[PDB]
């Protein structure tokens, strides 16, 4: 189990750690989060009590370094930093645990939710979508735009998701216009899976990361990317059977985790109705269709 200590909490803030969250009051004696499960990426995220504008946070993997949080009163945010001095850090952490100034990552033992949301997400792939090579952790916020969004403006603060565009020369083979537009299998299997992602695990990893950024930060370009990646699979007549079964599991846990009150803004009516009821894979997503129909029958 790993620990992310906090130097202090000088401003009142709601802190998230993965799908959990808690409120910290202005200058409350809070010194971090302990008992963080090893083996998964994690995200620690923030929403200030006095300006809910800009949810922001940090993706990290405790196996890659010792990380802590420190408020910067000049830039006005909680910043993740890495401590290279391992003994300084163990020293800091041990003192804060002895004084019981830390919240415990509150994982129920039955619960596989976080694993199921991050199964294919790798820190190495996050760091290629979020480019800031001097840090081992990645900052994301509500306002960051995607490469695709910028094409339609600061490139250093962009989310470099894989561009997917159904009416593009990449998506459409000369001479197979109708075939390729109505059945996206070429674009999914040859262009994206074989060509760009290399394998379905990397594809699902980016799909999962896009969802989590949409959910945790309200990042609109991330929600667009998540829906495009779902639509590309559902709009393909030929999909490896293992991918369809895994996609059903992935989407099920994403829909299960979504706050009931954010479904109006995080779920695209067209994509979901098309995917569950009109597409080639209309009959291949049983678990996702069941939870969607019981939880969000309005959208449909």
């Amino acid at each position: 189990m790993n620990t992310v200590p906090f130097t202090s909490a000088p401003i009142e803030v709601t802190i998230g750690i993965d799908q959990y969250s808690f409120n910290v009051k202005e200058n409350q004696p809070f010194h971090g989060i302990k008992d963080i499960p090893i083996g998964h990426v994690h995200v620690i995220h923030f929403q200030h009590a006095d300006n809910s504008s800009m949810r922001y946070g940090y993706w990290f993997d405790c196996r890659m370094g010792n990380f802590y949080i420190q408020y910067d009163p000049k830039d006005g945010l909680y910043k993740m930093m890495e401590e290279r001095d391992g003994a300084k850090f163990e020293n800091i952490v041990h003192n804060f645990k002895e004084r019981q100034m830390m919240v415990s990552y509150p994982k129920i033992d039955e619960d596989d939710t976080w694993y199921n949301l991050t199964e294919f997400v790798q820190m190495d792939k996050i760091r290629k979508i979020v480019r800031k090579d001097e840090n081992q952790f990645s900052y994301v916020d509500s306002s960051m735009t995607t490469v695709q969004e910028n094409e339609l403006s600061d490139p250093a603060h962009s989310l470099n998701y894989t561009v997917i565009n159904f009416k593009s020369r990449e998506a459409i083979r000369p001479g197979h216009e109708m075939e390729d537009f109505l059945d996206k299998s070429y674009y999914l299997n040859t262009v994206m899976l074989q060509g760009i992602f290399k394998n379905s695990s990397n594809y699902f990893g980016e799909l999962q990361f896009a969802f989590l950024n949409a959910m945790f930060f309200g990042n609109y370009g991330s929600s667009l990317q998540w829906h495009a990646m779902i639509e590309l699979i559902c709009s393909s007549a030929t999909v490896p059977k293992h991918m369809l079964d895994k996609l059903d599991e992935i989407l099920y846990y994403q829909i299960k985790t979504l706050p009931e009150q954010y479904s109006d803004i995080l779920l695209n009516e067209r994509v979901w109705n098309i995917c569950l009821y009109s597409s080639f894979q209309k009959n291949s997503l049983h678990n996702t269709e069941k939870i969607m129909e019981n939880k969000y029958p309005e959208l449909l």
Binding site: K167, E177, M178, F181
Partner: protein, 237 residues
């Protein structure tokens, strides 16, 4: 975006543009089978691709053999239209290629956009306007060449005959839509009006009769009467 009631004189500026109407590409007759089921038989069709400024009509004849062994023909027809329009554009010299193509039916947008990916600077536009081009097959010479075709064929016409010698494009298009609107509402009466006077003939190289300026005003007024008549016969007014 869409060409509507507010932005149509753009039809007659000097940016090359084409209307594309696909309503006569896939044509069928429905009939009973010996077993009392229903079946269709395709007949030859055509793409109606028109420069409204010059009157140049690129009539691509769609021979029934293009449907042989194909499924979902109404969907295929839109993609075949887009394939042929794209082929036409590529066949034209660069300085003759359109800047815009306006499709009369919105279902042509995605097929044409996808076929024209190589031409990102050609704008593909819908129109809220209700243009009467489905009635093109009521023009005897166009119907004749479509039905006589035994293979795919492109035939070029000027749908304005020599009108542009005497009137503007604006007025010429105006006349064409009125003629076609009349043929669409009551083809029999429309053709009666156009040929009632055997002394006015259609030149071998023309589609419409050789009306004087004054006779065109009469004709035009008779076509408006006919359209209003049918509007009353229809709605009882």
């Amino acid at each position: 975006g869409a060409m509507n009631s507010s932005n149509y004189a753009e039809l007659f500026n000097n940016d090359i543009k084409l209307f594309v109407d696909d309503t006569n590409v896939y044509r069928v007759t429905v009939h009973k089978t010996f077993e009392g089921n229903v079946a269709t038989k395709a007949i030859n069709g055509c793409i109606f691709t028109l420069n409204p400024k010059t009157g140049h009509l690129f009539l691509k004849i769609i021979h029934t053999s293009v449907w042989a062994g194909q499924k979902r023909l109404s969907q295929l027809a839109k993609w075949k239209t887009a394939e042929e329009v794209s082929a036409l554009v590529r066949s034209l010299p660069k300085e003759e290629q359109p800047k815009q193509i306006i499709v009369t039916r919105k279902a042509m947008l995605d097929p044409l956009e996808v076929h024209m990916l190589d031409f990102p600077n050609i704008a593909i536009r819908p129109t809220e306007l209700r243009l009467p081009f489905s009635a093109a097959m009521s023009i005897d010479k166009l119907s004749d060449v479509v039905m006589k075709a035994t293979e795919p064929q492109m035939v070029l016409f000027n749908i304005y005959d020599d009108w542009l010698d005497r009137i503007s494009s604006y007025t010429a298009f105006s006349r064409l839509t009125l003629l076609l609107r009349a043929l669409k509402t009551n083809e029999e009466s429309a053709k009666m009006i156009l040929l009632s006077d055997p002394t006015i003939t259609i030149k071998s190289y023309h589609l419409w009769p050789s009306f004087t300026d004054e006779q065109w005003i009469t004709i035009e007024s008779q076509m408006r009467d006919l359209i209003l008549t049918e509007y009353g016969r229809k709605y009882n007014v």
